[PDB]
Amino acid sequence: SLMRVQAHIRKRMVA
Amino acid sequence: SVADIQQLEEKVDESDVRIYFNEKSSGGKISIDNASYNARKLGLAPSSIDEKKIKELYGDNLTYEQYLEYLSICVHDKDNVEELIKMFAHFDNNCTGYLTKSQMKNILTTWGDALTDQEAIDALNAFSSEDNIDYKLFCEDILQ
């Protein structure tokens, strides 16, 4: 899960 | 193709996929890092697992078709907000529905695909002006 949360945060960082 | 690329290209626009590739390509190939950037611009959320899969198949630089296969791995149709909430809920020792910014930062920077301290705090500050973070709302927010 945590890796999914981190993945979406990095996504949000770009746009 | 072998990957589910037609379903990818129904979710994302092929024109954007192609345009973003051309923005970042060199010698007709794109680095994994730039592929992941493009994936994020398209609204997808790759993890280290996804990057490592594609790197192990094809190396650090991807052809167009290999980039399309990578994007298909990044789709994550099974992403589920309840699983993300339950992950944070595990750390909610007092069962308040809140974690402090520092608590959230520690989680995000210590395990998994760890963020840098600045990345974690910038993400948290972007979501909330206050120190108590409603992690249910945070998870609902980051998925959008």
Side-chain angles (χ1 to χ4, degrees), chain A residues 1 3-5 7-8 11, chain B residues 43-46 74-84 143:
Chain A
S1 285
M3 283 181 62
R4 301 313 306 141
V5 168
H8 283 278
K11 174 202 76 181
Chain B
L44 309 184
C74 296
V75 170
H76 293 296
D77 275 340
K78 293 178 177 171
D79 275 352
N80 170 284
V81 69
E82 299 282 8
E83 293 171 24
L84 309 187
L143 282 171

Side-chain angles (χ1 to χ4, degrees), chain A, chain B residues 37 44-46 48 76 79 108 111 113-114 141-144:
Chain A
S1 285
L2 177 54
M3 283 181 62
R4 301 313 306 141
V5 168
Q6 292 158 327
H8 283 278
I9 293 173
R10 289 193 176 84
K11 174 202 76 181
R12 293 291 291 230
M13 293 180 198
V14 176
Chain B
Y37 174 76
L44 309 184
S48 67
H76 293 296
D79 275 352
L108 290 167
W111 297 293
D113 292 341
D141 184 81
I142 68 173
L143 282 171
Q144 297 179 60

Side-chain angles (χ1 to χ4, degrees), chain B residues 35-92:
Chain B
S36 295
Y37 174 76
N38 287 0
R40 291 161 182 145
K41 285 214 296 181
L42 294 160
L44 309 184
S47 72
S48 67
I49 290 170
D50 303 328
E51 293 187 325
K52 288 176 181 178
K53 272 191 185 172
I54 202 74
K55 189 183 156 40
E56 269 149 41
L57 288 170
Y58 297 130
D60 291 314
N61 298 300
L62 309 181
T63 65
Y64 187 69
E65 168 59 50
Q66 292 165 1
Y67 159 80
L68 293 185
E69 290 183 346
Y70 178 52
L71 293 180
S72 79
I73 295 169
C74 296
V75 170
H76 293 296
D77 275 340
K78 293 178 177 171
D79 275 352
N80 170 284
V81 69
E82 299 282 8
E83 293 171 24
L84 309 187
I85 294 161
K86 288 164 187 174
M87 187 281 297
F88 283 116
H90 166 282
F91 297 98
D92 192 357

